[PDB]
DNA sequence: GGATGTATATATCTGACACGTGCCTGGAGACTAGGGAGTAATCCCCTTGGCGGTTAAAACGCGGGGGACAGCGCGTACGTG
């Protein structure tokens, strides 16, 4: 479910939702396919996701 | 009996407001052309994540000595009347 919601947030870009509870909130959505591969691998690759 | 402090009434200042007037500059309406929005193609530059190898620059430790800083004197230059 976490992988699915991260894929939905990246593919339909949701910077406000991708920030969410992060204090810094420094999310880079350049190289969309790289972030999609990271979401397909593990959600813990993203910052403030564990 | 003379002199003194307070209270309401009228004339004058003083900025603000109602009215008047010109006039000119902004607004209403119509028309047009062109500037900018949108589309497609092509090619070069940038992004994020990796790798390998060189090597010169960065980091760390330590001695020491040069310089920052504190204290004291003095005399003169500036404050003060």
Curated annotation (Swiss-Prot):
Disruption phenotype: Decreased sensitivity to the cytotoxic effects of 6-azauracil. Signal peptide: none annotated. It is found in: Nucleus. It comes from the Eukaryota. Coiled coil: none annotated. The 2 chromodomains are involved in the binding to the histone H3 methyllysine at position 4 (H3K4me3). The CHD1 helical C-terminal domain (CHCT) binds DNA and nucleosomes. Present with 1620 molecules/cell in log phase SD medium. ATP-dependent chromatin-remodeling factor which functions as substrate recognition component of the transcription regulatory histone acetylation (HAT) complexes SAGA and SLIK. It recognizes H3K4me. SAGA is involved in RNA polymerase II-dependent transcriptional regulation of approximately 10% of yeast genes. At the promoters, SAGA is required for recruitment of the basal transcription machinery. Component of the 1.8 MDa SAGA complex, which consists of at least of TRA1, CHD1, SPT7, TAF5, ADA3, SGF73, SPT20/ADA5, SPT8, TAF12, TAF6, HFI1/ADA1, UBP8, GCN5, ADA2, SPT3, SGF29, TAF10, TAF9, SGF11 and SUS1. TAF5, TAF6, TAF9, TAF19, TAF12 and ADA1 seem to be present in 2 copies. SAGA is built of 5 distinct domains with specialized functions. Domain I (containing TRA1) probably represents the activator interaction surface. Belongs to the SNF2/RAD54 helicase family. This is Chromo domain-containing protein 1. It comes from Saccharomyces cerevisiae (strain ATCC 204508 / S288c) (Baker's yeast).
